[PDB]
Scaffold this active site. Structure first.
Site, mmCIF file in Angstrom:
data_model
loop_
_atom_site.group_PDB
_atom_site.id
_atom_site.type_symbol
_atom_site.label_atom_id
_atom_site.label_comp_id
_atom_site.label_asym_id
_atom_site.label_seq_id
_atom_site.Cartn_x
_atom_site.Cartn_y
_atom_site.Cartn_z
ATOM 1 N N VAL A 110 16.965 17.340 8.241
ATOM 2 C CA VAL A 110 18.294 17.919 8.359
ATOM 3 C C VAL A 110 19.299 16.928 7.833
ATOM 4 O O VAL A 110 19.226 15.775 8.282
ATOM 5 C CB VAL A 110 18.657 18.222 9.845
ATOM 6 C CG1 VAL A 110 20.081 18.830 9.951
ATOM 7 C CG2 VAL A 110 17.663 19.231 10.406
ATOM 8 N N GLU A 120 23.549 9.933 6.139
ATOM 9 C CA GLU A 120 22.544 9.453 5.200
ATOM 10 C C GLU A 120 23.090 8.939 3.900
ATOM 11 O O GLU A 120 24.112 9.459 3.436
ATOM 12 C CB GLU A 120 21.568 10.538 4.792
ATOM 13 C CG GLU A 120 20.932 11.268 5.963
ATOM 14 C CD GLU A 120 21.673 12.455 6.588
ATOM 15 O OE1 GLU A 120 22.874 12.671 6.479
ATOM 16 O OE2 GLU A 120 21.010 13.211 7.238
ATOM 17 N N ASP A 155 0.075 -7.546 1.822
ATOM 18 C CA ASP A 155 0.608 -6.183 1.768
ATOM 19 C C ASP A 155 2.136 -6.117 1.973
ATOM 20 O O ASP A 155 2.640 -5.808 3.066
ATOM 21 C CB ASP A 155 -0.132 -5.366 2.847
ATOM 22 C CG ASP A 155 0.150 -3.871 2.829
ATOM 23 O OD1 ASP A 155 0.802 -3.377 1.893
ATOM 24 O OD2 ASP A 155 -0.262 -3.208 3.788
ATOM 25 N N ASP A 214 0.412 2.891 19.407
ATOM 26 C CA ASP A 214 0.171 2.234 18.116
ATOM 27 C C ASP A 214 1.092 2.819 17.067
ATOM 28 O O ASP A 214 1.695 3.883 17.279
ATOM 29 C CB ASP A 214 -1.310 2.460 17.679
ATOM 30 C CG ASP A 214 -1.904 1.633 16.548
ATOM 31 O OD1 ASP A 214 -1.278 0.677 16.071
ATOM 32 O OD2 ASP A 214 -3.045 1.922 16.176
ATOM 33 N N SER A 215 1.236 2.127 15.912
ATOM 34 C CA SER A 215 1.833 2.722 14.701
ATOM 35 C C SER A 215 0.743 3.611 14.062
ATOM 36 O O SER A 215 -0.423 3.642 14.527
ATOM 37 C CB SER A 215 2.296 1.631 13.724
ATOM 38 O OG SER A 215 1.251 0.739 13.440
ATOM 39 N N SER A 218 3.602 3.346 7.899
ATOM 40 C CA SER A 218 3.321 2.394 6.804
ATOM 41 C C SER A 218 4.571 1.807 6.114
ATOM 42 O O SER A 218 5.443 2.574 5.711
ATOM 43 C CB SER A 218 2.519 3.063 5.713
ATOM 44 O OG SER A 218 1.436 3.664 6.407
ATOM 45 N N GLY A 219 4.702 0.480 5.991
ATOM 46 C CA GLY A 219 5.841 -0.156 5.352
ATOM 47 C C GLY A 219 7.054 -0.366 6.252
ATOM 48 O O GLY A 219 7.989 -1.068 5.860
ATOM 49 N N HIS A 239 0.824 -1.195 0.000
ATOM 50 C CA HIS A 239 0.000 0.000 0.000
ATOM 51 C C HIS A 239 0.880 1.276 0.000
ATOM 52 O O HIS A 239 0.327 2.383 -0.083
ATOM 53 C CB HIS A 239 -0.981 -0.019 1.214
ATOM 54 C CG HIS A 239 -0.507 0.376 2.613
ATOM 55 N ND1 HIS A 239 0.063 -0.355 3.583
ATOM 56 C CD2 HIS A 239 -0.615 1.667 3.089
ATOM 57 C CE1 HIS A 239 0.309 0.429 4.595
ATOM 58 N NE2 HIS A 239 -0.101 1.650 4.301
ATOM 59 N N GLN A 296 -0.388 6.327 10.241
ATOM 60 C CA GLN A 296 0.000 6.600 8.874
ATOM 61 C C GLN A 296 1.285 7.423 8.899
ATOM 62 O O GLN A 296 1.532 8.274 9.763
ATOM 63 C CB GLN A 296 -1.160 7.344 8.236
ATOM 64 C CG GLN A 296 -0.975 7.842 6.808
ATOM 65 C CD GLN A 296 -2.263 8.503 6.347
ATOM 66 O OE1 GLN A 296 -3.191 7.838 5.895
ATOM 67 N NE2 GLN A 296 -2.451 9.801 6.485
ATOM 68 N N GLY A 297 2.161 7.051 7.997
ATOM 69 C CA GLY A 297 3.506 7.614 7.926
ATOM 70 C C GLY A 297 4.494 6.528 8.377
ATOM 71 O O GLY A 297 5.664 6.486 7.996
HETATM 72 CA CA LIG Z 1 18.730 13.630 7.971
#
Ligand SMILES: [Ca+2]
Length: 223
Positions: free
Chosen positions: A57, A62, A84, A171-172, A177-178, A40, A174-175
């Site tokens: 930031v 990264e 899913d 809870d988890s 997700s995955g 999804h 939206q955002g």
């Molecule tokens: Ca960063």
């Protein structure tokens, strides 16, 4: 993540942010070229951001790498959210180090009562909206399938488990997700769905990754 805590920078080194101009879903790095996330969360034009803590930031750890291919599960049903799960291949292999690490796939499924760690940059309020810039974490147990199916009659398949708190507040959301649900050092779950976030008697529902290890291993080897 509603009712969780700040993880600490790069303490969940397998956590990925999927970005398409902005963060919209989480994912897990399973080896230097492959990411698992939820079906999804499919979009065209994904960039996978590894080594992230503050997603607004650039902090120095990264790696930003574009997806070369996305494979949604052959039997994903977008109405039931059954199966899913989706695999994302990186255009170039990530450099693994202390802050970018892969997570292991399970050799068996986890039992009810096992404690897991869920993490994500998703909504933090149950009534309202507030999106964090740093990774949030939540410790949560897998719940009995009886209490999972009594909260959602006729909607849970064998490919889904519930984890969380029936009293609500944690809870988890939206955002998230995955994103990863790791229990005993293995990736056992993917943040999939629920009713709102952190509502009483409505726990998070998660893709049960242990049913999919053969499909994952066969697909990454032929792609
Ligand atoms: Ca960063």
């Amino acid at each position: 993540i509603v009712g969780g805590y700040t993880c600490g920078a790069n303490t969940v080194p397998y956590q990925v942010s999927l970005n398409s101009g902005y963060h919209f879903c989480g994912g897990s790095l399973i080896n230097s070229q492959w990411v698992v996330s939820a079906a999804h969360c499919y979009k065209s034009g994904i960039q996978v951001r590894l080594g992230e803590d503050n997603i607004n930031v650039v902090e120095g750890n990264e790696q930003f790498i574009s997806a070369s291919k996305s494979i949604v599960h052959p039997s994903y049903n977008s109405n039931t959210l059954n199966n899913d799960i989706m695999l994302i291949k990186l255009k170039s292999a990530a450099s693994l180090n202390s802050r970018v690490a892969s997570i292991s796939l399970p050799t068996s499924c986890a039992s009810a009562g096992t404690q897991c760690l869920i993490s994500g940059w998703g909504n933090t309020k149950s009534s309202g909206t507030s999106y964090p810039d740093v990774l949030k974490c939540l410790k949560a147990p897998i719940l009995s399938d009886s209490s999972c199916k009594s909260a959602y009659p006729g909607q849970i398949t064998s490919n889904m488990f519930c984890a969380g708190y029936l009293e609500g507040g944690k809870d988890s959301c939206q955002g998230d997700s995955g994103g990863p649900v790791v229990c005993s050092g293995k990736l056992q779950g993917i943040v999939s769905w629920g009713s709102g976030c952190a509502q009483k008697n409505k726990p998070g529902v998660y893709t049960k990754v242990c049913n999919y290890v053969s499909w994952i291993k066969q697909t990454i080897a032929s792609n």
